[PDB]
Amino acid sequence: DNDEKLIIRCRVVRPKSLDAETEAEEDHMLKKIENTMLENITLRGVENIERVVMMK
Amino acid sequence: YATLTIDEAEKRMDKKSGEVPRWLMKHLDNIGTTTTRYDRTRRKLKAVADQ
Amino acid sequence: KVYEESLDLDLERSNRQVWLVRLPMFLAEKWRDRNNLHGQELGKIRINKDGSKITLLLNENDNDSIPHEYDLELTKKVVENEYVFTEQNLKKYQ
Amino acid sequence: DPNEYNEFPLRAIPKEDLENMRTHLLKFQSKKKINPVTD
Amino acid sequence: KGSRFISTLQVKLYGREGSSARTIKATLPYIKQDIPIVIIFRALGIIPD
Amino acid sequence: YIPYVKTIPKKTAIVGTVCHECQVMPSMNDPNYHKIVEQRRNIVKLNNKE
Amino acid sequence: TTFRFCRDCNNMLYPREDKENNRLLFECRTCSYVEEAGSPLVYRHELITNIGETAGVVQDIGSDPTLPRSDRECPKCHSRENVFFQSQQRRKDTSMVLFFVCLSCSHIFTSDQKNK
Numbered sequence: 031d032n033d034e035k036l037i038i039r040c041r042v043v044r045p046k047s048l049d050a051e052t053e054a055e056e057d058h059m060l061k062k063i064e065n066t067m068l069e070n071i072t073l074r075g076v077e078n079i080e081r082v083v084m085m086k
Numbered sequence: 087y088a089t090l091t092i093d094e095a096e097k098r099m100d101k102k103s104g105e106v107p108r109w110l111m112k113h114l115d116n117i118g119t120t121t122t123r124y125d126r127t128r129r130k131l132k133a134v135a136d137q
Numbered sequence: 138k139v140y141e142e143s144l145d146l147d148l149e150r151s152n153r154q155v156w157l158v159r160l161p162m163f164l165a166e167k168w169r170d171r172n173n174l175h176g177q178e179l180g181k182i183r184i185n186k187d188g189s190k191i192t193l194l195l196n197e198n199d200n201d202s203i204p205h206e207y208d209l210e211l212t213k214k215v216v217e218n219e220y221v222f223t224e225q226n227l228k229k230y231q
Numbered sequence: 232d233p234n235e236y237n238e239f240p241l242r243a244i245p246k247e248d249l250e251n252m253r254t255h256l257l258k259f260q261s262k263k264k265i266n267p268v269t270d
Numbered sequence: 271k272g273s274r275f276i277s278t279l280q281v282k283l284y285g286r287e288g289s290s291a292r293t294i295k296a297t298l299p300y301i302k303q304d305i306p307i308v309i310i311f312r313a314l315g316i317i318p319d
Numbered sequence: 320y321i322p323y324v325k326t327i328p329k330k331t332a333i334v335g336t337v338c339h340e341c342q343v344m345p346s347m348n349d350p351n352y353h354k355i356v357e358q359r360r361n362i363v364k365l366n367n368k369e
Numbered sequence: 370t371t372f373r374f375c376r377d378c379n380n381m382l383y384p385r386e387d388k389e390n391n392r393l394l395f396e397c398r399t400c401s402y403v404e405e406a407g408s409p410l411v412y413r414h415e416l417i418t419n420i421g422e423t424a425g426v427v428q429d430i431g432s433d434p435t436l437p438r439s440d441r442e443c444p445k446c447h448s449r450e451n452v453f454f455q456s457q458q459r460r461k462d463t464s465m466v467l468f469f470v471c472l473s474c475s476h477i478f479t480s481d482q483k484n485k
């Protein structure tokens with residue numbers, strides 16, 4: 031938190047078997063997982079609950 | 087740059103796969119398919135100069 | 138035998154400087170006439186010794202109905218990939 | 232004005248050589264330089 | 271002036287903002303299918319992307 | 320390949336290379352100038368249809 | 370992102386990795402032309418973007434009779450005439466901060482006092 035900028039760095043670790051066909055879509059895969067990790071990640075809360083406001 | 091044909095193109099456009107491979111042209115160039123007139127002529131001319 | 142002339146494109150006069158000039162309507166309507174162009178002097182083209190400015194001076198044949206002085210504005214000083222080619226029929230026998 | 236310039240005559244093309252012949256403009260659409268004389 | 275008939279051209283942006291691939295397709299008269307815009311551009315003579 | 324292509328031969332020749340693209344514009348310091356302006360104004364004024 | 374285009378056919382280049390040097394190369398998918406990248410960045414998604422805040426500023430923006438005038442001081446030439454306008458991004462989340470264009474030096478400044 032004390033850092034001036036709040037940054038996450040992620041790396042996908044490849045299996046022991048080496049894939050020669052996936053290199054062309056390697057960066058393509060990152061964008062796909064990047065899209066999924068933005069949308070379908072539930073940090074916390076109840077699904078279908080858009081916003082909550084406190085009133086007295 | 088060794089273009090495809092309409093029939094080959096349409097097979098790729100349809101759901102043969104999720105998306106065309108990025109280096110498909112490089113792959114098919116080595117198989118021997120999809121050459122150019124320049125290469126198609128040079129190899130034939132060399133096929134005559136060899137004899 | 139069907140053609141008595143070479144069918145190859147003639148790359149002999151290609152090394153010839155050519156200017157692509159866009160004309161105003163009043164001037165293009167009398168310079169593009171095929172009932173004209175008998176080889177007469179349409180005027181003179183004047184270029185400053187140091188360049189950067191060109192001007193066209195027509196003769197006094199315009200009948201004092203249009204300007205006698207024009208400024209050739211170089212919209213492109215260096216032009217590439219533009220060429221002029223002719224086209225006519227071939228002799229057909231032997 | 233002073234003769235600090237060069238003026239060449241501008242003459243029309245004789246129509247005796249402009250018949251049965253059409254002069255067109257050719258434009259190579261590319262980003263490199265194409266010269267059919269050397270290339 | 272000349273024929274008085276109307277032909278409509280629609281350029282559609284398929285997909286939503288939560289999609290990983292949003293392409294553009296155009297509807298041409300008497301074609302029955304929405305063609306990608308790039309194909310139409312190449313059909314008009316502009317091949318370079 | 321294809322054995323028939325149905326070409327149309329013609330006599331062609333490259334007779335020049337373009338070096339300058341020019342735009343002829345009448346000089347505004349010319350006496351007969353502003354007759355063109357009126358001519359260009361008559362272009363929009365005209366009512367050819369009857 | 371600085372899109373790159375091919376030198377021989379003008380098509381779009383794509384990033385490829387060469388393990389012989391562990392570097393980044395940009396190659397064409399049809400004509401086999403390669404070029405080493407100058408930057409290691411290949412993609413950027415701008416969820417909160419500010420591209421378009423001052424879109425439409427031209428050399429004759431002051432000629433627009435509909436743009437409001439102001440008396441604010443330009444902090445690059447010290448002139449008082451200027452035209453101001455709100456943000457041009459039509460997302461319904463943008464602030465009402467103003468942007469000022471000076472009619473004497475074409476400098477664009479802002480009224481923001483929070484972040485600037």
Ligand SMILES: [Zn+2]
Pocket residue numbers: 375376377378379380397398399400401402
């Ligand atoms: Zn290329």
Ligand SMILES: [Zn+2]
Pocket residue numbers: 443444445446447448471472473474475476
């Ligand atoms: Zn100022």
